[PDB]
Design a binder for this molecule. Sequence first.
Ligand SMILES: CCCCCCCCOCCOCCOCCOCCO
Length: 305
Amino acid sequence: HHHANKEATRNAAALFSVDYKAFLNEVANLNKRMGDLRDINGEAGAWARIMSGTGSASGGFSDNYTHVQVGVDKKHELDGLDLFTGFTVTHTDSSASADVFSGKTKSVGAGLYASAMFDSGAYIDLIGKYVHHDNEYTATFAGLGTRDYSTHSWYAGAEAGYRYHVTEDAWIEPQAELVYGSVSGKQFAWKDQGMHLSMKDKDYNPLIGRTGVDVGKSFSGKDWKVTARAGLGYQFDLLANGETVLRDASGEKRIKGEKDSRMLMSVGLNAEIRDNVRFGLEFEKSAFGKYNVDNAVNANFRYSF
Ligand SMILES: CCCCCCCCOCCOCCOCCOCCO
């Protein structure tokens, strides 16, 4: 009976954990979202982004996702400060698998951002958005079967960093980011072998921090620039306020959320072609987490005019 409860707990937690990965997948940063916004002349901008990636965690859990996003903004020219304010919309397709389940998630989001680029090299990036998730998951345990459900998430993120130039062409940039969010809970109630089974979790609020450093070496000519860059960071949960409750004829088991953290690694470039076009590309992965990004690639394109 202990073994049964252990397995049930492990499985319920695995299945419900996908809502948290769905949330984590929508978390980016200034460079990953917008590319390089320094020294841009155009007073308006249109941009697109695509990300594709895969991750894993124990229990044979693995997922992969394709994230697509666009935005438009106006750039306000202030005294030593460019301030980009704009709108954004996103789409995500995810699939997930573990030993005991598999399924998919379709997401649609919309948000608002302000990005402040200071001549001094300082920057601040603020974003808030809402994401809707349609979910379809099939479980191989407990006769739970196929389950469709909606969730939605709010995001409020703030990021600051500082680009210190070691030389005219090389630079170092410490960064810190905090992202506060919400994840709607859901319930499954069903019968198996003529017994009433329940599995439910509550609304919770992720709070994800990151601290890291980026480094870059740039090259250019009259009408182009290319920056090679690499990143090392630390991404961590500050809260784990979720809880799954497994109810049963014999009683309830409560399963509290666990914090997880991981080391982020990235390598990439930012390109400038003439006056309107920018392009950003990076390869990334993480290590040491219970969940890790095993690999993902991010591309963006900004047209400034
Ligand atoms: C921590 C959450 C705070 C979120 C910051 C939001 C405040 C800044 O948002 C301003 C958005 O305004 C959009 C500007 O209008 C868009 C014009 O661009 C379209 C025309 O090309």
